[PDB]
Design an enzyme around this catalytic site. Sequence first.
Site, PDB file in Angstrom:
ATOM      1  N   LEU A  43      17.954  49.041  63.645  1.00 27.78           N
ATOM      2  CA  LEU A  43      16.828  48.959  64.568  1.00 27.78           C
ATOM      3  C   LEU A  43      16.234  50.316  64.900  1.00 27.78           C
ATOM      4  O   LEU A  43      15.025  50.409  65.144  1.00 27.78           O
ATOM      5  CB  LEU A  43      17.257  48.262  65.863  1.00 27.78           C
ATOM      6  CG  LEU A  43      17.694  46.808  65.713  1.00 27.78           C
ATOM      7  CD1 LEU A  43      18.066  46.240  67.066  1.00 27.78           C
ATOM      8  CD2 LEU A  43      16.606  45.978  65.055  1.00 27.78           C
ATOM      9  N   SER A  49      22.733  58.530  68.432  1.00 29.21           N
ATOM     10  CA  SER A  49      23.310  57.304  67.887  1.00 29.21           C
ATOM     11  C   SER A  49      22.347  56.661  66.895  1.00 29.21           C
ATOM     12  O   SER A  49      21.195  57.072  66.752  1.00 29.21           O
ATOM     13  CB  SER A  49      23.658  56.313  68.998  1.00 29.21           C
ATOM     14  OG  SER A  49      22.479  55.880  69.657  1.00 29.21           O
ATOM     15  N   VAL A  51      21.266  52.469  65.944  1.00 33.72           N
ATOM     16  CA  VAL A  51      21.303  51.171  66.608  1.00 33.72           C
ATOM     17  C   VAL A  51      21.008  50.073  65.596  1.00 33.72           C
ATOM     18  O   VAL A  51      20.059  50.169  64.810  1.00 33.72           O
ATOM     19  CB  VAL A  51      20.322  51.112  67.795  1.00 33.72           C
ATOM     20  CG1 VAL A  51      20.269  49.711  68.373  1.00 33.72           C
ATOM     21  CG2 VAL A  51      20.788  52.044  68.858  1.00 33.72           C
ATOM     22  N   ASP A 154      17.419  58.238  82.903  1.00 35.38           N
ATOM     23  CA  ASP A 154      16.532  58.121  81.750  1.00 35.38           C
ATOM     24  C   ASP A 154      15.710  56.842  81.871  1.00 35.38           C
ATOM     25  O   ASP A 154      15.549  56.084  80.912  1.00 35.38           O
ATOM     26  CB  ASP A 154      17.338  58.169  80.452  1.00 35.38           C
ATOM     27  CG  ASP A 154      16.485  58.489  79.217  1.00 35.38           C
ATOM     28  OD1 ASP A 154      15.387  59.077  79.341  1.00 35.38           O
ATOM     29  OD2 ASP A 154      16.938  58.144  78.097  1.00 35.38           O
TER      30      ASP A 154
HETATM   31  C1  LIG Z   1      17.283  44.497  70.907  1.00 35.90           C
HETATM   32  O1  LIG Z   1      17.961  44.308  72.134  1.00 35.90           O
HETATM   33  C2  LIG Z   1      18.713  45.428  72.576  1.00 35.90           C
HETATM   34  C3  LIG Z   1      18.315  46.687  72.265  1.00 35.90           C
HETATM   35  C4  LIG Z   1      19.074  47.793  72.705  1.00 35.90           C
HETATM   36  C5  LIG Z   1      20.190  47.563  73.452  1.00 35.90           C
HETATM   37  C6  LIG Z   1      21.096  48.695  73.990  1.00 35.90           C
HETATM   38  C7  LIG Z   1      20.912  50.014  73.842  1.00 35.90           C
HETATM   39  S1  LIG Z   1      20.061  50.904  72.769  1.00 35.90           S
HETATM   40  C8  LIG Z   1      20.344  52.488  73.233  1.00 35.90           C
HETATM   41  N1  LIG Z   1      19.916  53.644  72.747  1.00 35.90           N
HETATM   42  C9  LIG Z   1      19.056  53.790  71.672  1.00 35.90           C
HETATM   43  C10 LIG Z   1      17.811  53.302  71.729  1.00 35.90           C
HETATM   44  C11 LIG Z   1      16.964  53.465  70.677  1.00 35.90           C
HETATM   45  C12 LIG Z   1      17.407  54.157  69.539  1.00 35.90           C
HETATM   46  C13 LIG Z   1      18.662  54.654  69.514  1.00 35.90           C
HETATM   47 CL1  LIG Z   1      19.262  55.513  68.112  1.00 35.90          CL
HETATM   48  C14 LIG Z   1      19.498  54.502  70.551  1.00 35.90           C
HETATM   49  N2  LIG Z   1      21.306  52.495  74.461  1.00 35.90           N
HETATM   50  C15 LIG Z   1      21.679  50.967  74.860  1.00 35.90           C
HETATM   51  O2  LIG Z   1      22.339  50.633  75.713  1.00 35.90           O
HETATM   52  C16 LIG Z   1      20.604  46.295  73.764  1.00 35.90           C
HETATM   53  C17 LIG Z   1      19.854  45.224  73.331  1.00 35.90           C
HETATM   54  O3  LIG Z   1      20.284  43.882  73.671  1.00 35.90           O
END
Ligand SMILES: COc1ccc(/C=C2\S/C(=N\c3cccc(Cl)c3)NC2=O)cc1O
EC number: 2.7.11.1
Length: 328
Positions: A43, A49, A51, A154
């Site tokens: 994603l 990180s 994802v 954030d």
């Molecule tokens: C599609 O639904 C969801 C989407 C995200 C999360 C949880 C995340 S994502 C996150 N950091 C990110 C964000 C963008 C890029 C990168 Cl590399 C790291 N920190 C969280 O807790 C949970 C969901 O259910």
Amino acid sequence: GPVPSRARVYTDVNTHRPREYWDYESHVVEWGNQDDYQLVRKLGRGKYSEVFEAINITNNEKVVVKILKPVKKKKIKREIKILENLRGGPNIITLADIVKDPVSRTPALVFEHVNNTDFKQLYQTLTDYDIRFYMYEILKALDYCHSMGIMHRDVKPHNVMIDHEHRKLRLIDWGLAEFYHPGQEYNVRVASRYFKGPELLVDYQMYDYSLDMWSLGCMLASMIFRKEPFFHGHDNYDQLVRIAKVLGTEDLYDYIDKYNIELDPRFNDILGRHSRKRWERFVHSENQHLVSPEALDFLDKLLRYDHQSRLTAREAMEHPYFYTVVKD
Ligand SMILES: COc1ccc(/C=C2\S/C(=N\c3cccc(Cl)c3)NC2=O)cc1O
């Protein structure tokens, strides 16, 4: 030296918690089974990180897996401890599991999945009622985490996942969040540029939960005025100048004088002199359906230079702007 500051609410919650609540460096991670989760598609990628959407094959349900890049163990433990402390809270993303990824050689955090629409497109369609509703939902998450001794640090549209079909909201990405302790000096290199509070931009380290309320005000301004981001600085210095062109330079000087703070001398050539503006100047025919006297007063009470003068999350939830929101 700078004048000290304390949060005006939830000041001592961590003081009277048991030490294990906030002492994340001593946390012992409970690891799950890495083979429970099959990655489906990537994603996104950030500096900390990557994802993925994944499937939990023990229940065939979608989950989201954040595989951490190499960072300090204390920061990983901090995020894990905060997610476990807040789990179950209103509109807080649920950490479902933590596993060791065998390829990255780092932890992978497993979250509940939200079927979200990207904010760029979602914000083009939200009505006045939608904005009040979702702001109230964010405030529930923020009052909860503040009441639990934690600042998010954030808050921004990218970290508010909204499933618009089910009117469901989750506050995500707790990797910058911290425990509030009275008198503690914090790193000012937090939040995204457009959402950084004045305290960060003038290098005032003894800040608190009220940082998140500035960030929320920046989100609100972008939504009701249809200008995203609202304060659109080209770097951290210009960011403060953009703020000062709206809130004015005299109140900026009042703020730094109150805390016996000095501005970076590099502002001598770029800051100028600016009157404080009235919020009505940002209203026009293409956003006026999102603006009301209640919205402008609420916005005005979030976007204060002085972190001690901003509405708390609970006070914000009492504001007349939310009187039209249905509460069951
Ligand atoms: C599609 O639904 C969801 C989407 C995200 C999360 C949880 C995340 S994502 C996150 N950091 C990110 C964000 C963008 C890029 C990168 Cl590399 C790291 N920190 C969280 O807790 C949970 C969901 O259910």
